[PDB]
Write a protein that binds this ligand. Structure first.
Ligand SMILES: CC(=O)NCC(=O)N1[C@@H]2CC[C@H]1c1ccc(Nc3ncc(C(F)(F)F)c(NC4CCC4)n3)cc12
Length: 289
């Protein structure tokens, strides 16, 4: 396990575990304070006794995280054992997920473009490292209190090599999964680009396509239907960004690097600092109730 700490280190001493902020890839996630620096962190806690077929996946997740050095990937600080519980210390992103920031109401196209541009920067980094996220969706897109946008939850992240230029494993969240991943055909990083497209619709409309239906229906709906399109009063460049991602033929989908030059992004995206308005809005909203 990369970043595994000295097992004599007691994380209950080194860290103040605060409120739960979410349920994660495995186990729960908490807000916490690093007791040495007084920096806030995120703590993922997993019971190893309450495992197992997950520990390979937990190894794999932590391995992948430890191999990423990008402003666009959640930082991983190390892991601690406390009796049966694994404490995974993560970068704390105080804005929550893009999905949280949607709860007060719709995004405008500038905010959508900005968030998509930053996701594309993350996807470009990952894909350049032959890594595939495979669970891109709004809930896995996090923001710092400054409005920086980062990719999270590498629970099902894949790795490509010289040997394996392609993967076949059935992973992801159904609504966001690419048809070729659902069919377990040979696939690569283009799968993430399909997921990005679904996420673009999610960011624009609040939900992915087929969100009313039972997840098992999409197992045939997605491979046999025409891809979703963004329906509603949204700009033509936003609709074409979505369609460019959502092609059933993976070689017809652009790369992350290409989509960064897409007209929707260029014409509408602004500096990420402006996303603070979106976090302030969430605050005010969450005040009431
Ligand atoms: C009591 C209270 O108000 N707590 C804060 C809270 O509930 N928040 C804030 C704003 C929305 C929601 C929330 C969710 C997530 C975070 N931050 C965060 N940072 C890093 C991770 C990381 F573990 F990926 F690194 C992470 N993961 C959780 C698992 C579901 C998302 N969440 C912050 C918040």
């Amino acid at each position: 396990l990369p970043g595994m700490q000295n097992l004599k280190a007691d994380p209950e001493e080194l860290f103040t575990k605060l409120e739960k902020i979410g349920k994660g890839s495995f186990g729960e996630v908490f807000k916490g304070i690093d007791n040495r620096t007084q920096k806030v962190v995120a703590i993922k806690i997993i019971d190893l006794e309450e495992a197992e077929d997950e520990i390979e996946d937990i190894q794999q997740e932590i391995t992948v995280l430890s191999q990423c050095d990008s402003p666009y990937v959640t930082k991983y600080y190390g892991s601690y054992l406390k009796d049966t519980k694994l404490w995974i210390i993560m970068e704390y992103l105080g804005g929550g997920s893009a999905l949280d920031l949607l709860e007060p109401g719709p995004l405008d196209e500038t905010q959508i473009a900005t968030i998509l541009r930053e996701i594309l920067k993350g996807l470009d980094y990952l894909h350049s490292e032959k890594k595939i996220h495979r669970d891109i969706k709004a809930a896995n897109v996090l923001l710092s209190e400054h409005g920086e946008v980062k990719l999270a939850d590498f629970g099902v992240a894949g790795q490509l090599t010289d040997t394996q230029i392609k993967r076949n494993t059935f992973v992801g969240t159904p609504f966001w999964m690419a048809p070729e991943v659902i069919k377990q055909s040979a696939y690569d990083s283009k799968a993430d680009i399909w997921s990005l497209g679904i996420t673009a619709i999610e960011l624009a409309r609040g939900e992915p396509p087929h969100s009313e239906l039972h997840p098992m229906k999409v197992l045939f709906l997605i491979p046999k239907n025409n891809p979703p399109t963004l329906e509603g009063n949204y700009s033509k460049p936003l609709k074409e960004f979505v369609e460019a991602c959502l092609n059933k033929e993976p070689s017809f989908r652009p790369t992350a690097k290409e989509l960064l030059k897409h007209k929707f992004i260029l014409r509408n995206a602004k500096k990420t600092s402006y996303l603070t308005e979106l976090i302030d809005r969430y605050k005010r909203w969450k005040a009431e109730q």
